[PDB]
Chains A and B, each alone.
Chain A
Amino acid sequence: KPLPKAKAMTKWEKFAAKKGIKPKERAGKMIYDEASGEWVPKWGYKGANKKLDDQWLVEVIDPRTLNRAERKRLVKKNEKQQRRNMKN
């Protein structure tokens, strides 16, 4: 088969080369939860970002629905950027 030479910068690596941004540490998803005795991973397991939906009160339409809508908006924006990089 032809070599997989169809690499693409995806419009981000060029901006990273243009600035001081550096690759993520890749050390681990785990991070200590605030005001808690046990670590809550931020990804790949029960997430603290989704803990906001599970809290008994938000002190503010349901706010949890707005948070889920914001998460779905970020996911759709990532999928749109991925499709846009697929276009090139």
Chain B
Amino acid sequence: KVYKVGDIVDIKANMPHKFYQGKTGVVYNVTKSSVGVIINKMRYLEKRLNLRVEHIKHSKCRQEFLERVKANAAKRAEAKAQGVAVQLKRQPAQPRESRIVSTEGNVPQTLAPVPY
């Protein structure tokens, strides 16, 4: 593995004097036996928190941002290829449209708790 200053990381133990498991942080220092990680906590304080390399993993939360940015650039190029609004913006989930379910192959069986 490899690490560098300023990389995002999420604490993850492989009870251990503390319960910092799962807290996200960014690297601030590196050493052969450990890798430093800042951990903001509540006013917010600059509580640096070193951790063993075994109990760490690179965060993936920021990968979605770069992926959406590249997809937005590709959609903008595609919109330039034609005449249309790029419409690349994310949207909240929306209510399902009405649809006519058919009872032909699906008769509504009653259950009426047996209770069984």
Identify the A interface with B (CB < 8 A).
35, 55-65
- Nearest first, the 4 A-B pairs at minimum CB distance are A56-B55, A57-B51, A62-B33, A55-B17
Q: Are B31 and A59 in contact (CB under 8 A)?
A: no
Q: Are B52 and A57 in contact (CB under 8 A)?
A: yes
Query: In the docked arrangement, what's the CA distance between A21 and B103, Å?
Result: 93
**Contacting residues, chain A, for B55 (C-beta < 8 A):** 56-57
Q: List 8 A-B contacts (CB under 8 A).
A: A56-B13, A56-B16, A59-B47, A59-B49, A62-B31, A62-B33, A63-B50, A65-B33
Main secondary structure of the interface of A (DSSP, over half): loop
> How far does the Cβ of B30 sit from chain A's closest Cβ, in whole Å?
10
> How far does the Cβ of A41 sit from chain B's closest Cβ, in whole Å?
18
B51-62 Cβ-contact flags toward A at 8 Å (1 or 0): 110110000000
Contacts A55-B16, A56-B16, A57-B18 given: A64-B33 contact, CB under 8 Å? Answer: yes
Residue of B11, B16, B48 near A60 (CB, 8 A) is B48
**Contacting residues, chain B, for A61 (C-beta < 8 A):** 31
Complex: chain A residue closest to B56, CB-CB? A56
**Contacting residues, chain A, for B31 (C-beta < 8 A):** 61-62
B12-49 Cβ-contact flags toward A at 8 Å (1 or 0): 01011110100000000001011000000000000111
Q: Are B18 and A59 in contact (CB under 8 A)?
A: yes
